[PDB]
Amino acid sequence: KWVIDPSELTFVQEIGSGQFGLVHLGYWLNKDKVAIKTIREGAMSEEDFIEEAEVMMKLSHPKLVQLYGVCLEQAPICLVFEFMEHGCLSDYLRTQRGLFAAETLLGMCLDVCEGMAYLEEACVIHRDLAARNCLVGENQVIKVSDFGMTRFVLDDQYTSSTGTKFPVKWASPEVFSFSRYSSKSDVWSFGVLMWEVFSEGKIPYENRSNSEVVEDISTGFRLYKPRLASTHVYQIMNHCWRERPEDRPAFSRLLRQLAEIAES
């Protein structure tokens, strides 16, 4: 089943917090360690999420964070996930800055690409792919998390392309203009995630307002090459940022290209 009773969970340590609610490390009965995300009232369209949870849980891949179930008996609801020991990739990059080999950084991009090629084949669009939405686990494996979750967020300032909080830094032009999501808009976001990885967690378009990012991208500006990215890796990042979605590589193509670079 996909419904987890409240008696099947324990809450050991709070590990995260934000406007969504809280995250705890806990245990799940007869099924080991978990991260439990408690959702604040009004943050999410809970009925829409609960309607799709069972189908969402069948998206299972070694490079995707597994959703194990939903505790919905009483408010607030909890979502129960696979526990990732090193936390979000954005913070992991920042705290370990200066300690990465370029091969490790490319390997993190490959893990994300592998999870995204699975979602692309399943015709599942992430919509908000970024280093903050990737988690680091056993042996520094990266896994993609929160795919499709912006479909349930109730904060219009974050979900509307004209919203004050919209994540325009990772959005392709057709997303920041029209909310035209596709696997090719996720590819643009993946180019920005690659830039976050090779820069060791710098924030893209630092200090630029949302309208300034739109004006810059529309006028051909692109993120500068990080020092640790080779010319060839930066070439692939620029292919992710092609203005037309049709000219961007699919994740299946990126996965072969990046693997050839890593394995050579």
Ligand X SMILES: Cc1cc2[nH]c(-c3n[nH]c4c3C[C@@H]3C[C@]3(C)C4)nc2cc1N(C)C(=O)[C@H](C)N1CCOCC1
Nearer to ligand X, 91 or 216 (CB): 91
**3-class SS of residue 31:** coil
The CB-of-149 to ligand X minimum distance in angstroms stands at: 9
Looking at residues 32 to 71 of the shown chain, list those that interact with ligand X (rule: CB under 6 A): 35, 37, 65
Instruction: Give the residue, chosen from 2, 8, 15, 221, that forms a contact with ligand X under the rule CB under 6 A.
Output: 15
The CB-of-52 to ligand X minimum distance in angstroms stands at: 16
The CB-of-172 to ligand X minimum distance in angstroms stands at: 24
Nearer to ligand X, 90 or 145 (CB): 145
Alpha-helical regions (H) of 34-159: 46-57, 89-95, 102-121, 156-159
**Which two tokens mark 150?**
């912006």
Of the residues 111, 128, 146, 186, only one is catalytic, namely: 128
Instruction: Give the residue, chosen from 40, 61, 86, 180, that forms a contact with ligand X under the rule CB under 6 A.
Output: 86
Q: How far is CA 264 from CA 4, 103, 194, 257, in A?
A: 46, 11, 19, 11
Cβ atoms within 10 Å, residue 82: 17
Enumerate the β-bridge partners of residue 11. 26
The CB-of-134 to ligand X minimum distance in angstroms stands at: 11
The CB-of-35 to ligand X minimum distance in angstroms stands at: 3
225 annotated to bind ligand: no
135 is a site residue for ligand X (CB under 6 A): yes
Cβ atoms within 10 Å, residue 58: 9
Q: Do you know the residue count of the chain?
A: 264
Task: Find where tokens 């943050």 sit.
Answer: 43
16 annotated to bind ligand: yes
Residues 6+ apart with CB under 8 A from 239: 191, 247, 248, 249
Binding string to ligand X for residues 146 to 165, with x set by CB under 6 A, is what?
A: x-------------------
**3-class SS of residue 238:** helix
- Residue by residue, DSSP assigns 133-144 as GEEE-GGG-EEE
Residue in the shown chain whose Cβ atom is closest to ligand X: 87
143 neighbors 135 (Cβ within 8 angstroms): yes
What's the rounded Cα separation, in Å, for the pair 207 and 90?
18
Please say if 128 is a catalytic residue.
Answer: yes
Stretch in the footprint of ligand X (CB under 6 A) among 40-48, 82-90, 163-171, 246-254: 82-90
Size of the site for ligand X (CB under 6 A): 18
The residues assigned a catalytic role are: 128
Sequence ranges of the binding site for ATP: 15-23, 37
Binding footprint of ligand X on the chain (CB under 6 A): 13, 15-16, 23, 25, 35, 37, 65, 81-87, 135, 145-146
